[PDB]
Amino acid sequence: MRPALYFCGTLYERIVSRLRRFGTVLTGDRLIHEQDLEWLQQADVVVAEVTQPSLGVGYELGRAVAFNKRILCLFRPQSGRVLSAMIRGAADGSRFQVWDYEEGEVEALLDRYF
Amino acid sequence: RPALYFCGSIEDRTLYERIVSRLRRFGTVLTEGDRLIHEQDLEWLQQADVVVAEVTQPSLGVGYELGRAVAFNKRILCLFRPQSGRVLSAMIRGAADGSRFQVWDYEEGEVEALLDRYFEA
Numbered sequence: 001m002r003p004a005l006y007f008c009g010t011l012y013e014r015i016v017s018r019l020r021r022f023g024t025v026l027t028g029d030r031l032i033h034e035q036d037l038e039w040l041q042q043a044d045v046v047v048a049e050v051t052q053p054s055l056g057v058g059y060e061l062g063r064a065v066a067f068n069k070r071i072l073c074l075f076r077p078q079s080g081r082v083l084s085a086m087i088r089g090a091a092d093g094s095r096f097q098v099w100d101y102e103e104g105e106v107e108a109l110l111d112r113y114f
Numbered sequence: 115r116p117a118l119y120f121c122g123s124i125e126d127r128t129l130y131e132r133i134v135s136r137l138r139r140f141g142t143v144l145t146e147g148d149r150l151i152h153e154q155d156l157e158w159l160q161q162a163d164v165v166v167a168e169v170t171q172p173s174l175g176v177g178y179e180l181g182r183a184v185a186f187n188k189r190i191l192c193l194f195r196p197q198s199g200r201v202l203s204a205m206i207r208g209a210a211d212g213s214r215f216q217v218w219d220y221e222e223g224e225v226e227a228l229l230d231r232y233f234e235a
């Protein structure tokens with residue numbers, strides 16, 4: 001099966017270029033929300049870069065958990081930030097995973113996950 | 115007693131205290147290692163009758179809570195300050211339907227009158 005992939009967040013372009021080798025990458029304010037929710041529902045795996053705080057990214061992860069999607073969150077500790085306890089605490093190590101990473105290992109990590 | 119859930123990114127504290135003081139007049143405010151925090155948060159979110167979120171500061175936690183609340187069909191009120199100089203995320207602004215999910219723009223001074231107006235309907 002070729003998974004439908006959803007990505008949210010030049011580092012993003014490196015991530016999406018690697019994601020493209022495993023499946024199709026799907027990615028008025030009300031129109032944006034409705035289009036976003038249609039893609040989230042079609043996706044087989046939801047990939048989120050969670051290093052920068054975002055209400056949009058968090059909202060997408062919450063809607064994705066309720067649809068029981070496979071989720072992968074990517075966080076850079078070298079950013080100097082401490083990841084939200086709600087994102088870090090949502091991980092179960094299987095369907096919802098939170099991976100700490102360094103800029104240079106983007107491609108090897110995505111290869112290892114898929 | 116109606117159960118109210120309040121969230122906001124964590125100066126901001128004193129504005130949050132004014133919000134929670136006003137919320138307390140309409141019901142019990144549930145929100146007054148990391149896995150334990152998440153599980154406790156999800157138990158409160160499920161018990162809530164209305165979810166109140168201050169969405170002026172970007173937060174992954176607040177956004178995650180709103181997303182889980184929408185999937186539970188909760189009545190939701192988001193409070194945003196345009197005078198902060200920020201542009202509210204199109205996902206939060208776009209999630210509003212004007213009834214079950216509402217996004218209200220406000221100025222610091224109208225906190226109490228706005229919460230009175232929402233809970234008097």
Ligand SMILES: CC(C)(C)C(=O)N1CCN(C(=O)C2=CN/C(=C3\C=CC(Cl)=CC3)N2)CC1
Pocket residue numbers: 007008009012013016027031032033035036
């Ligand atoms: C390289 C690309 C793929 C362009 C990238 O950097 N992305 C990261 C930022 N990003 C998002 O976080 C995101 C999630 N949903 C949406 C939209 C939903 C609906 C509509 Cl109409 C527009 C956008 N955006 C888009 C993908």
Ligand SMILES: CC(C)(C)C(=O)N1CCN(C(=O)C2=CN/C(=C3\C=CC(Cl)=CC3)N2)CC1
Pocket residue numbers: 120121122123124127130131134145146150151152154155
């Ligand atoms: C004055 C108070 C009420 C203290 C305030 O400023 N608050 C606003 C910020 N805030 C939150 O965004 C929030 C949502 N859920 C939680 C927790 C969930 C689980 C556990 Cl174990 C602890 C907290 N926190 C806490 C409440």
